[PDB]
Amino acid sequence: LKQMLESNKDSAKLDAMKRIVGMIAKGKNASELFPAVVKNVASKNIEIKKLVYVYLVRYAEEQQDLALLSISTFQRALKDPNQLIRASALRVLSSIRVPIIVPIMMLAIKEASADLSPYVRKNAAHAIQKLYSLDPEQKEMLIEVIEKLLKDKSTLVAGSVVMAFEEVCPDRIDLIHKNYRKLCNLLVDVEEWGQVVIIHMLTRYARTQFVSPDPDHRLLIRNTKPLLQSRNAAVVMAVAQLYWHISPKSEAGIISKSLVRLLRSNREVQYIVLQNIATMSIQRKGMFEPYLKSFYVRSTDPTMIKTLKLEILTNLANEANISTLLREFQTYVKSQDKQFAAATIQTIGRCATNILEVTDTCLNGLVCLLSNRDEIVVAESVVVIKKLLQMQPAQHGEIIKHMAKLLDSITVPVARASILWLIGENCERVPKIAPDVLRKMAKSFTSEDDLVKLQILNLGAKLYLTNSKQTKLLTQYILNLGKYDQNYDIRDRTRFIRQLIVPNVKSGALSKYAKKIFLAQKPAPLLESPFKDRDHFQLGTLSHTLNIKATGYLELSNWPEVAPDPSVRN
């Protein structure tokens, strides 16, 4: 496709540009024809100029040396009276990664910042963040350019300026310490993406510089109020997560109306808000108490969005409505969505721990579930039951005996593991059922999963401690089977439990102590919703939705004691 590139007719060049645009769209290497395109950089055709400049943007990092050869055209194009051409040329020179060009881009960015066009100014903010990605050492004149840019009144430039300021200099707070009032005044009219960025950075500044709820506190809250009704979920979300961290607890409850309203949005947006609501519902349960019904699971939602609603229902669970939710949850148990049932069964287990009054009432429902045929449901039922028998360590013989026989039809490793621990823990409560189950699994040992093999070795040792009279040989066999296993997690069990159990030759005081530590009352597992771990992070970020402080996290501090002088603010 060279010929029509050096062909004089401009239409041929335009066709070649469109076709190479498609070529890049298909992800194909068109870098070889770079010299012909860059030879067309001096075109007077605006469309051809745009296309060749997009080509330069896409293939600048590939043919770096050839682009370096043609820089003079780029500095000449920086003066083109067309604003878009100026921005694109600035982008092109930014994309070039030669360590020597740096001062040229100094002059380019300072001119662009001095440019009257706001578009060029925001692209100059993009240029300075690109430079900081290129050279950290130029941060001084980077900061002075930031100081010049932050003074501009336009919101269009303001959003990009704030984003760049966050990208390069999160620490030099004084620049915003001079312009917080300008930012909050503009935030009424700032564009929605700029709304989000400015709201987050203002959240940082409020956490770092201000003390406990100051008229400036209300000024943010007063101006942020009309945005609760905004069509943008991000504005509503950011405004909502703003009030969670700055607004008084007696006023933050108002945003719950909009958060529920956001749940009618599409799948992805409602996915994030469910994470936000679930985290913030733990600390203030009564806030979403009036909207318990809206959090009821609909069959139309997919698996994980349904799962998130259940977790919120766990937080909203209380003695005044435990009965209402338990009935509704039982309805969801026999849903066709097997994965949702796995979430639902775990959901009822947690609130059962939360409400000690309904321990048996939830328990009575569970045992009926043990009779159903669905392998996943019966597997997930037994583990949820297992958490409940430990917390209420009563001799529930009527419950274990139904559970104990059910093992022979169970295939799931988690469920098969669940059977072994309780019967071992309750070996003295069902002494006529425990001995055969160990005998049953001992012959099949080599076929079970690793996690099950851990508990089956546990079952023997606990059975050996209490009823060695008739199970000693079974323990000997089950120990010897794990002695030559392949998988390694089990080997620690072979090393650990055996030494506590078998070698009475070196029987110290701790060897005597093995019987009590294995038969000790196991404390109730403090079940935690996977959202209290998000209490360390501001609401509505990746670090919120990923639960990890990844590269670039905008971490908030604790609330300081004494207010730094608000008089400087004027």
Partner: protein, 151 residues
Amino acid sequence: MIKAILIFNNHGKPRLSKFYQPYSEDTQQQIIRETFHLVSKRDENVCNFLEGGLLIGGSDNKLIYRHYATLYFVFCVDSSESELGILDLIQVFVETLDKCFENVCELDLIFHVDKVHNILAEMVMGGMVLETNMNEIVTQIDAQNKLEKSE
């Protein structure tokens, strides 16, 4: 033997399709679409040797092609065919079309497709190639055209 002859543009619109195996019309369209999807996504720097799909009789057969302008000339061949032989056969076909249609393009393949079938016929006939020396091919072609103009 070659199993099938496939020609289509970069958009998947067929331009020449003649088959030497019994395949149904829907099977023909499915073969064309499978070949287009298998081929057109590949780079310009890729080898033009793509293992064939299931619509063309199994994995033994292969899809081999060349791209000129916006046209893909795919020959469905078996494992006994010389793949570079098939490529240069496609090249001979391209140059023969160039000479006979006087700088052929996609327009001639659209608007003179029966002529293209005839050209294919003297190049390859019954899964077996008939004539391959471009000059003598052109002599036979314009001898047939002299016949046509004669009556």
